[PDB]
């Protein structure tokens, strides 16, 4: 009160300095039943994948793809993600989640890069510049290697032009390189493009193939279908906490509900458009939303000349969490005895700390509100105020009390009639003698005209009020000497 009221002497009354807040604690996070299970097990656990003349541009849609199982698969060789990190792959997704599959030879996996051609990037599969998505290579030695070489994945090393990025290269006809045409029977310049990967068990680990799937992410004007999964906590109840459900969020208290939602909603609103109830998408249970409580501090003093003790009122707050509504562990031990103690009380206005309730009724001296006042009788007391003396004086149909003695006393009555006149000049108050600011201020039109004409009006009207209140006499009258 000494710092806020700009004094060292504070007169008896009620004062408001600050407020108090209760804080979120756990920051709970919920997501629905993710649980849709895209068919990626057949493109992660099969013994014969697609070919490089037949790598299908398959649309996997309307499910979810887990990528946290990919990091703990314990077999990956050249896990590559362009554009976005694979650490934040699972939480955030994009549209156009088209997928590819081939068992590429492991010698030139590193040539598949934006801005780098080769013979795998030139005749098998090319990545565009600024790729968003992942290309995922792993060791697959134990399954695609039969006796004498696994000749199941034929490939192309011969084609007319360079690859367009993400191009379906399917052909049976042969490469043209000379001028003499082929006659069906293969000749010296026929150049059959479909030769064989030799995938023998005697090959080295760089020579044994690296099995690639492509999680390409494009951006067209179509909504997304397949994303990564979402991890979710549990929900805490009857506590001020931050929440984040499936799209909607806030800070508040989750309690049990009593109203009946229809089976299609997930939340509710009220009059003037604020949320008040929510249904969780993993239990289908309606939970009421209560905001975290707050209020301002009201401090009661009988005057700095009189006492040094104070009384503290926390308004419209339940009087149990008032030490943990404040940061009583962070403040002084002086503030700690005004957060807990024997002298606790709950009023209709709120929780009062620093006074004891008195059953007796006295005259009100300090206005708190809702009938309770406080005073000092050497400790601070709390009491419901007394209206005055009761009177039941005897009604009689044939008796009158008539006074026979008289009192002459007078009563002061004070009213203010006038004001000290104050006017301001607008222009160099606003600018402070700047040429371009004054060229700005006349260019705000004529605000100075209404301003000076209204602030002349207070002075001239106050002059009329003084002229009315103190001139109702024609002359100057004088008393006898």
């Amino acid at each position, epitope marked *: 009160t000494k710092c806020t009221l700009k004094s060292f002497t504070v007169e008896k009354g009620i004062y408001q300095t600050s407020n108090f807040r209760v804080q979120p604690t756990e920051s709970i996070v919920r997501f629905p039943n993710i649980t849709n299970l895209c068919p990626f097990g057949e493109v992660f656990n099969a013994t014969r994948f697609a070919s490089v003349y037949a790598w299908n541009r398959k649309r996997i849609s309307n499910c979810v793809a887990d990528y946290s199982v990919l*990091y703990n698969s314990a077999s990956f060789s050249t896990f*590559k993600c362009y554009g976005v990190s694979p650490t934040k792959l699972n939480d955030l997704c994009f549209t156009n989640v088209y997928a590819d599959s081939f068992v590429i030879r492991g010698d030139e996996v*590193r040539q598949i890069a934006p801005g780098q051609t080769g013979k795998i990037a030139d005749y098998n599969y090319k990545l565009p510049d600024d790729f968003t998505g992942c290309v995922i290579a792993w060791n697959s030695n134990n399954l695609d290697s039969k006796v004498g070489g696994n000749y199941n994945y034929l490939y192309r090393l011969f084609r007319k032009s360079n690859l367009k990025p993400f191009e379906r290269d399917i052909s049976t006809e042969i490469y043209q390189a000379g001028s003499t045409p082929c006659n069906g029977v293969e000749g010296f310049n026929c150049y059959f493009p479909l030769q064989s990967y030799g995938f023998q068990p005697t090959n080295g680990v760089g020579y044994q193939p690296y099995r690639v799937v492509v999680l390409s992410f494009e951006l067209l004007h179509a909504p997304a279908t397949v994303c990564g999964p979402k991890k979710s906590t549990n929900l805490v109840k009857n506590k001020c906490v931050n929440f984040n459900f499936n799209g909607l969020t806030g800070t508040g208290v989750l309690t049990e509900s009593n109203k009946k939602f229809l089976p299609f909603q997930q939340f509710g609103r009220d009059i003037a458009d604020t949320t008040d109830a929510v249904r969780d998408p993993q239990t289908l249970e309606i939970l009421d939303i209560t905001p975290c409580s707050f209020g301002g501090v009201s401090v009661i003093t009988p005057g700095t000349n009189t006492s040094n003790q104070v009384a503290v009122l926390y308004q419209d707050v339940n009087c149990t969490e008032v030490p943990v509504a404040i940061h009583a562990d962070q403040l002084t031990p002086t503030w700690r005895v005004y957060s807990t103690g024997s002298n606790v009380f709950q009023t209709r206005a709120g929780c009062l700390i620093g006074a004891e309730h008195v059953n007796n009724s006295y005259e009100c001296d300090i206005p708190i509100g809702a009938g309770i006042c406080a005073s000092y009788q050497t400790s601070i007391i709390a009491y419901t105020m007394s209206l005055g003396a009761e009177n039941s004086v005897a009604y009689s149909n044939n008796s009158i009390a008539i006074p026979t003695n008289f009192t002459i006393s007078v009563t002061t009555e004070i009213l203010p009639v006038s004001m000290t006149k104050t006017s301001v000049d607008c222009t160099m108050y606003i600018c402070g003698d700047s040429t371009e600011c004054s060229n700005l201020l006349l260019q705000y039109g004529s605000f100075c005209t209404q301003l000076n004409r209204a602030l002349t009006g207070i002075a001239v009207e106050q002059d009329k009020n003084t002229q009315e209140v103190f001139a109702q006499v024609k002359q100057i009258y004088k008393t006898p000497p």
Partner: nanobody
Amino acid sequence: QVQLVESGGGSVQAGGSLRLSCAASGSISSITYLGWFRQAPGKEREGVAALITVNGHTYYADSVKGRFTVSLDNAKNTVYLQMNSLKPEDTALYYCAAAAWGYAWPLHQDDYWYWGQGTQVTVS
């Protein structure tokens, strides 16, 4: 955004052990793959050891397998490389490298690496 300052080099005889440390400063949370490089005099810079910060999975080269190990210390944001059973074919400039683009084995020079300043490891 990733700066690497390493130490732990020095001189030791055959049969001894040293302990390389590479400290990371800056974007620690984007670092997902820590690889250790090695360039012999007259030979190309190759790969020795590898570590994933997300998974803890180690990829080891064939000439250092059974003798060389890598460990992660996230309290000091430092990666540790312990070289036991040293032989004089390991005398080379040892490099630590960080990746914010994923994990890839074997290590390749053409990839995007945040490099270290280099400590000389000498054994005879």
